[PDB]
Write a protein that binds this ligand. Structure first.
Ligand code: I0G
Ligand code: I0G
Lengths: 222, 221
């Protein structure tokens, strides 16, 4: 019970953060992004396994969640590290792209504008490092509906992270009407992250590295 | 004042779209498509009746309407299907159960999302008042751009939120639960959005033109 307490939880998530990912480059832009995603996915699994109780869900839900959230969690990560630099998307330490470079590949420009706009909204709200940690945990725990309709366990966990986020906003010292508004504002943003995630998945499947199959392999590895 | 919690809910209540009968003299998709086109007209009316919507720049109005329509149709579908597991009450003469979804490829998947999301709103015991606020929110939160008149949209979105928060408050539940229920309701918005995208992808992969017809309506005003 206690390891899921608001304070402990935020610190545990903090330590569970993924490492920086160097793509190490010796079609191409899309080759880069794809190789990057594959690499991040490995660390994403590690991350999820470090979230208190995740490992104690049924392997069936762990797999459902991961398979449904990966693109969203990757994009949440992109937005967060691009949060202080308008017009750019810091994908990895050796891969910073600005809006315009998105014109090369067709279809990508639209997605970039979504990501940049959502990032802009997170910068305007002044997203906090610990609010960000809870949100990202929520994106995962809330990626799939089915595993909720072990379900007892997922719901408890999803409530834990939420209490944590509510706790985080509370010590913000702001009023009670604002606390509610900020909670609502942060959550509504999730719809946009999901959205961008869908446009990304769609675009990725309309393509002719196999990230999705590679993810399924990683899912079998465990 | 017209945006004050109690008043706003009653106003949204009166703005509800009428029942829509398709009146049937490929086909399933033909029906669903004829239905959408019809509901879209009433959806515009609905949105205009939301306090202050008509006051946003026509550019924002069009922007919001163009991206939320599918979500609002599905929020409507879920709400009227909420008491009937395994089925989707699309219209008074169009009730489809899950399996009828195997006929058209790609649709069974989407039906299962809608049935699951509806299933969850039933578990949360979504109230008629909450449903009214949530749907307004789906519209007001459909596009990020018009927000990043912006002043106006933000104020509007906050108004509906206060309303929802107000609604949950008179629920008499504790403050920890109030926060949880608010958070539980909002997260469902990601799934509605999700289903909305799957529905759009599918509709565009098809070979009635709802989207163009929508764009026309967007001009008739
Ligand atoms: O950290 C990351 C790493 C990678 C990505 C995705 O990469 C893709 C690859 C191939 C595609 O057809 C689409 C995409 C998504 C559209 C833009 C970025 C997004 C997000 C975040
Ligand atoms: O009230 C309504 C009326 C209509 C709809 C959409 O209709 C479609 C039509 C054509 C398509 O290729 C997909 C769809 C969506 C997939 C299931 C229903 C949804 C939702 C809600």
């Amino acid at each position: 019970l206690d390891a899921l307490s608001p304070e402990q939880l935020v610190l545990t998530l903090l330590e569970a953060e993924p490492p920086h990912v160097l793509i190490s480059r010796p079609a191409s832009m899309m080759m880069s992004l794809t190789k990057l995603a594959d690499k991040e996915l490995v660390h994403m699994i590690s991350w999820a396994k470090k979230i208190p109780g995740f490992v104690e869900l049924s392997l069936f839900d762990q797999v459902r969640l991961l398979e449904s959230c990966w693109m969203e969690v990757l994009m949440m990560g992109l937005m967060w590290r691009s949060i202080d630099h308008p017009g750019k998307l810091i994908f990895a330490p050796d891969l910073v792209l600005d809006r315009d470079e998105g014109k090369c590949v067709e279809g990508i420009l639209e997605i970039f504008d979504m990501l940049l706009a959502t990032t802009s909204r997170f910068r305007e709200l002044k997203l906090q490092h610990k609010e960000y940690l809870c949100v990202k945990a929520m994106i995962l725990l809330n990626s799939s509906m089915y595993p909720l309709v072990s379900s007892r366990k997922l719901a408890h966990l999803l409530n834990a992270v939420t209490d944590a986020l509510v706790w985080v906003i509370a010590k913000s010292g702001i009023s009670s009407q604002q606390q509610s508004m900020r909670l609502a504002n942060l959550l509504m943003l999730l719809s946009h992250v999901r959205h961008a995630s869908n446009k990304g998945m769609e675009h990725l499947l309309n393509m002719k590295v196999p990230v999705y199959d590679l993810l399924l392999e990683m899912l079998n590895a465990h």
